[PDB]
Amino acid sequence: SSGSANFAGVEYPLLPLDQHTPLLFQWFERNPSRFGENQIPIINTQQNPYLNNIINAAIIEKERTIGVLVDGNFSAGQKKALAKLEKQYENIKVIYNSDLDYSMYDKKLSDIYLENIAKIEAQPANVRDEYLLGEIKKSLNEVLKNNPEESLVSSHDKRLGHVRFDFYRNLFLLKGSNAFLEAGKHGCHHLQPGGGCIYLDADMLLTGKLGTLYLPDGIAVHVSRKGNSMSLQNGIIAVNRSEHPALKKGLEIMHSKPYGDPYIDGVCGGLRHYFNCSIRHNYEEFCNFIEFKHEHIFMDTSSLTISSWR
Ligand SMILES: O=c1ccn([C@@H]2O[C@H](COP(=O)(O)OP(=O)(O)O)[C@@H](O)[C@H]2O)c(=O)[nH]1
Ligand SMILES: CC(=O)N[C@@H]1[C@@H](O)[C@H](O)[C@@H](CO)O[C@H]1O
Ligand SMILES: [Mg+2]
C-alpha cells in the first residue's frame, strides 16, 4: 500500500499491482475466414494493427505474462499459427475461451425472471413497475417457448457482437490469474493463485514499461474522454486479485436485473455500487477517482482510425 484516495465519504488505500501481474488482450472473431488458413486469426490491418500491438506489448513487458483470450470457429491451421505465436514469444499465452469453465458464474434466466416477478409483487401496488412486470413476463414466456434451460451464459453465448466479448471479459477477469492455471498455461512462473490481471484493449499502445500500479482498492478502469463528455469504460480493467468485489458486484447486478448488460451493469453498475457513486454523487469526481492513468500507454488509438466492431 502507498497513499489513499477519498470518494463518497470512504477512504480507499491505493493497493499495489506488481510488475508480475499479467496483461490481458482479447480477440473474439466473428469471421475467421477473413484470415488465411495458416494466418494468426487476430486483426492486423494498417488501421487496426492489433496483433502488432500485442506483440509490441509482449516485447516491452518481457518479464510479464501476456494473455491473449481468443474465441471463434478457427481452422486447424489458424490454431497452429496461434501455437507458433506462443512459441515465438515465451510470455504470450493463448487461452481459448471454450477451454474455461464459466458455469460457476451462471444463472437460469427463468430464475431471474421469477425472482423479479416476486420482488415486484412484494412491493406496494402504487409503486410497482407494471410495464417492466409485463415485459419480464413476456421474456419468460418466450424462454419457455424456445429454451426453458436458457441461462446468462447461454443467452450471451448466442450473441454475435460486442455484448458477448464484454460478458466473457468480465467473467475472465473474475477468474483472474487463476484462468491461466485453469487453461494449463505452462511456464507462467510468476502467477499466484488468486492473482490479479490487467486487461487492455489491443489499441492501447504501450510506449514503455508499466512498472507497479497503485489503484484504489486494487481496481481501476478506463475513462473515455471523447469530445465534451467522459464515461466509465471497460477498454482497460485492472484488478489486483481474482474475484474482485467490484466485478463480483457487477455479476451480482446481472444476476438480479432481468436484462443486465455486461458493460452498463457488470462494469459501471458494479463499480458505482461498490464505491457508492449514486445518481446524487458527482459522476465526474468518480471518473477522476477510478480512472486508469498511465504515461506509457497511448490510449484508444482506434479513435484515430476506425473501431474494429462499430
Ligand atoms: O471483432 C472484434 C472487435 C473487437 N474486439 C474487442 O474489442 C476491443 C475494442 O476494440 P476497438 O478499440 O477497435 O473498439 P472501440 O471500443 O475503441 O471502438 C478490442 O481490443 C478487442 O478486445 C474483439 O474481440 N473482436
Ligand atoms: C463509445 C462506445 O462505443 N463505447 C463502447 C461501449 O459501448 C462498449 O460496451 C465497450 C465494449 O465493447 O466498448 C466501448 O468502446
Ligand atoms: Mg479503441
Overall resolution, Å: 2.6
Question: Residue 140 is which amino acid?
Answer: L
C-alpha of residue 86 to centroid of ligand 1, in Å = 21
Return the DSSP state at 177.
Answer: T
Whole-number Å distance between alpha carbons of 94 and 96: 7
User: Alpha-carbon distance 33 to 138, whole Å?
Assistant: 38
Quote the CA–CA distance of 67 and 91 in Å, as a whole number.
8
Hey, is 94 helix, strand or coil?
A: strand
Radius of gyration of the chain (CA): 20
* In the chain, domain spans: 1-108+151-310, 109-150
* CB of 251 shorter than 6 A to ligand 1: no
Grid cell, residue 95, equals: 487461452
Report how far residue 242's alpha carbon sits from residue 191's, in angstroms, rounded to the nearest whole number: 12
- The grid cell for 274 is 461498490
For residue 16, how many other CB atoms are within 10 A of its CB?
A: 16
162 CB near ligand 2 (under 6 Å): yes
Residue 203 Cα, ligand 1 centroid: separation in angstroms?
8
Specify the residue with its C-alpha closest to ligand 2, atom 5: 233
Experimental technique? X-ray
- Decide: 16 and 213 in contact? Cβ < 8 Å: yes
